[PDB]
Amino acid sequence: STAGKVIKCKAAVLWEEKKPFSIEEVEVAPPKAHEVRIKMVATGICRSDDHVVSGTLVTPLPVIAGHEAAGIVESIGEGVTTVRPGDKVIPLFTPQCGKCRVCKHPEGNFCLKNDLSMPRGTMQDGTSRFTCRGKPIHHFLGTSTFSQYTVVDEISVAKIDAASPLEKVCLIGCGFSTGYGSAVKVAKVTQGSTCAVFGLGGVGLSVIMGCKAAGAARIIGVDINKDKFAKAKEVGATECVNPQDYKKPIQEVLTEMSNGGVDFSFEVIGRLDTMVTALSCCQEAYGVSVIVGVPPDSQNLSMNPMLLLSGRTWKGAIFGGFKSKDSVPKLVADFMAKKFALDPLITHVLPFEKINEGFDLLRSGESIRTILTF
Amino acid sequence: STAGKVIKCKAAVLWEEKKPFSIEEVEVAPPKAHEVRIKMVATGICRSDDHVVSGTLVTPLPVIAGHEAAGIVESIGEGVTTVRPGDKVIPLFTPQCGKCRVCKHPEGNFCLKNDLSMPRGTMQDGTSRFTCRGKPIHHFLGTSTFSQYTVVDEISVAKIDAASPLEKVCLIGCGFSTGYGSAVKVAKVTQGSTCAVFGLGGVGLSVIMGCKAAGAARIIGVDINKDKFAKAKEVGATECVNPQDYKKPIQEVLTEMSNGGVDFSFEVIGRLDTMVTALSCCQEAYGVSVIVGVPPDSQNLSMNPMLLLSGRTWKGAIFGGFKSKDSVPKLVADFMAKKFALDPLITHVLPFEKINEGFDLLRSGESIRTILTF
Ligand SMILES: [N]C(=O)C1=[C][N+]([C]2O[C]([C]OP(=O)([O-])OP(=O)([O-])O[C][C]3O[C](N4[C]=NC5=C4N=[C][N+]=C5[N])[C]([O])[C]3[O])[C]([O])[C]2[O])=[C][C]=C1N1=[C]C(I)=[C][N]1
Ligand SMILES: [N]C(=O)C1=[C][N+]([C]2O[C]([C]OP(=O)([O-])OP(=O)([O-])O[C][C]3O[C](N4[C]=NC5=C4N=[C][N+]=C5[N])[C]([O])[C]3[O])[C]([O])[C]2[O])=[C][C]=C1N1=[C]C(I)=[C][N]1
Ligand SMILES: [Zn+2]
Ligand SMILES: [Zn+2]
Ligand SMILES: [Zn+2]
Ligand SMILES: [Zn+2]
Secondary structure (H helix, E strand, C coil): CCCCCEEEEEEEEECCCCCCCEEEEEEEECCCCCEEEEEEEEEEEHHHHHHHHHCCCCCCCCCCCCCCCEEEEECCCCCCCCCCCCCCCCHEECCCCCHHHHHCCCCCCCCCCCCCEEECCCCCCCCEEEEEEEEEEEEECCCCCCCCEEEEHHHHHHHHHHHCCCHHHHHHHHHHHHHHHHHHHHHCCCCCCCEEEEECCCHHHHHHHHHHHHCCCCEEEEEECCCHCCCCCHCCCCCCCCCHCCCCCCCHHHHHCCCCEEEEEEEEECCCHHHHHHHEEECCCCCCEEECCCCCCCCCCECCCCHHCCCCCEECHHHHHHHHHHHHHHHHHHCCCCCCCHHHHHEEEEEEEHHHHHHHHHHHCCCCEEEEEE | CCCCCCHHHHHHEEECCCCCCCCEEECCCCCCCEEEEEEHHHHHCCCCHHHHCCCCCCCCCCEEEECCCEEEEEEECCCCCCCCCCEEEEEEEECCCCCCCCCCCCCCCCCCCCCCCCCCCCCEEEEEEEECCCCCECEEEEEECEEEEEEEEEEEEECCCCCCCCCHHHHHHCCHHHHHHHHHHHHHHCCCCCEECCCCCHHHHHHHHHHHCCCCCCEEEECCCHHHHHHHHHHCCCCCEEEHCCCCCHHHHHHCCCCCCCEEEEEEECCCHHHHHHHEEECCCCCCECCCCCCCCCCCCEEEEEECCCEEEEEEECCCHCCHHHHHHHHHHHCCCCCCCCHEEEEEEEHHHHHHHHHHHCCCCCCCCCECCC
8 A cells, every 4th residue: 555655654853963853744755676664663762862862973964863673564675585565674773785894704793884984874875765844854874763664775674573572672673782792792701700881771781681691700880870770780780889989980999899800891881981991990911891882973082002902802893793684583583582581671661752752761861761662 | 059149240231211221240149939040041132121221111220121031040049849950941021920810811911920010120029139339220020131140030930941042032032922922812813814014023023923824815014114024025924015105094005905904903013103003904893903012101092982883803912912931831842843933033143242232223223133142
């Protein structure tokens, strides 16, 4: 009934920075060759979406944001082979083209077709499928999930189990997989190790899940909001510390607590200072620190390279280092097999029309993940 | 015969920064418990010794420098069990106490007993074995090899093959092992990979040796002194580039040359800017950059953490990541079995008495390693 036709539907359009989303009617073009049009079922509110609002993350405006989601294929363009109308799917904000040097490399996941490094806010072919009040609207990360319908390139979508609960597994599209993979795949946390996790939001809690799954003996949560500590302990933190409680820098505190530095630290906030602190608190000869948070655009940190010369390793990753199209269906299968839990991350479930209220909960510190339902 | 007695001998004392060494008589006390007094046979001139002169590497003055050396045990203190008088030995500027958390860790080598992090310029017991003009003189990195005799703690000396040629294997005490291990142990260079090596001195040439040994397909040497290129090619560089020849920054050149960034890069100079350039030139999703050079004291670099967030790994190491006391005798055994060559590193030989000429050769750019003979 809609295949081949322009769809008019509701989306949340961001017309300019530092404004509420506008919930209004948009036109969604049909998919061109190698494109997929998805009916959205559920989408999470990630801090990275708020970064677009705040100007922390720069991407062309006006835009349809949203990148953590799940939905059902409405139609496919010519030449699509990996999904069919009716399939449950998760959009992939890091694509997997399968052809580039990164996709071919055993470790890399930051596919060269990404729209992260040099954001264009379009489909692969450099155009947009969205119109609103007669004006073209940009895509975001090739996904644009804050809309009843989106169009994505085939390399930016994965088919998942037909029985999966979309209102939970949307989190595999960003927050859960990013944190969990940062621990198990990027850091490669070891059994019996001591971990420090800076930032106890949806992503940091998922890092904790991964550290516990990996067998860490101690997992120290760090957050300036002590209301975040109870849930961090539920999912595996052994101890939580608030930097504001101490008269000395928290890297010194964590170094003392761990009798000379932690084995693994994770920055899961997005601040230059905590990136350096998290590096410093890992053991100087063999510690590993992983940057997960997204910092403000175009700002450099300052650090003393002796922190590295003694033996520390510093790395970062997008999407937990997971090759996105290969990994997403397997993560959903693992969820269906009860290998990990997603409910601990979900604090609020709201209709899509309450998107602004959902962002206000995040900004105020009150929520972990709000899932919006279409 | 000299056991238990003070030895008067010649050493090269550095009384103040930015002045020639003074070759003059010092008094060397006998070894206390768990100390070893060594008659030096050969010592190399490493750029880190020059860093003491220049104030790049800060350690208490006046001082007897020198850390890349080999000699013969003259006497042992009470309780020493790992060397005997007459044994050939290499002093270990990074100790291996065998008891601390780092020594017990499978990967770590920066032993907590080191005198690098918070330099005191003493023996383990906080005192000095050197007197000159009636004044106490500091040790350097627990080794102080610019002296006809030195005293070192037992954890800072390794017994080596009785037949080894000390005028060659002194290089295993620093420059060869540092560079080679940075490639084979720290970076873990893989077969068929592309490597970039910044700085083609003694240590950078040893990194090239390691990259070639590990099977790299391309090894790009980078130096502003084109006179360094011929020897770099002899030990395995496939191409060399001088940043001075280009209008574009060399990270851009190297990214172009490697069709999108190198697999492994190494900073082997000691400049903040080239540390950042070397990180930038490795591939953004899966590249690894290793800092080997020693930066100017207390100075911070500035960098954009997005370089890490895409997936790069940044690390550093002292002494090529080798656990020193375990590794040095094995490296000497491998040299004796022709598993690697040291002669390409040695461009000049001088008597100890011409130490200042040896430093002039390093500073002029003419030498790689000058070996000084006692
Ligand atoms: N890498 C990748 O991929 C990624 C990234 N991301 C990031 O991360 C971060 C985080 O997120 P989330 O979790 O979502 O957030 P929230 O919830 O908001 O949480 C946070 C936390 O933190 C804390 N804090 C603050 N501040 C501070 C703290 N702590 C401590 N200290 C301080 N100072 C609070 O409280 C909370 O709790 C961010 O940054 C983001 O962005 C994510 C994800 C992923 N992505 C990327 C993308 I381009 C998209 N997505
Ligand atoms: N880590 C460890 O352990 C170490 C370190 N270290 C260091 O390193 C470096 C290097 O050294 P050497 O090799 O000896 O030096 P030389 O010979 O001088 O070489 C260098 C080079 O570079 C170059 N450049 C300059 N500038 C530049 C360049 N290139 C490029 N760019 C630029 N800009 C020149 O020309 C030459 O050739 C240093 O830093 C040192 O220090 C060593 C060893 C080891 N240690 C440590 C220690 I305490 C002691 N030892
Ligand atoms: Zn790709
Ligand atoms: Zn996200
Ligand atoms: Zn130790
Ligand atoms: Zn050295």
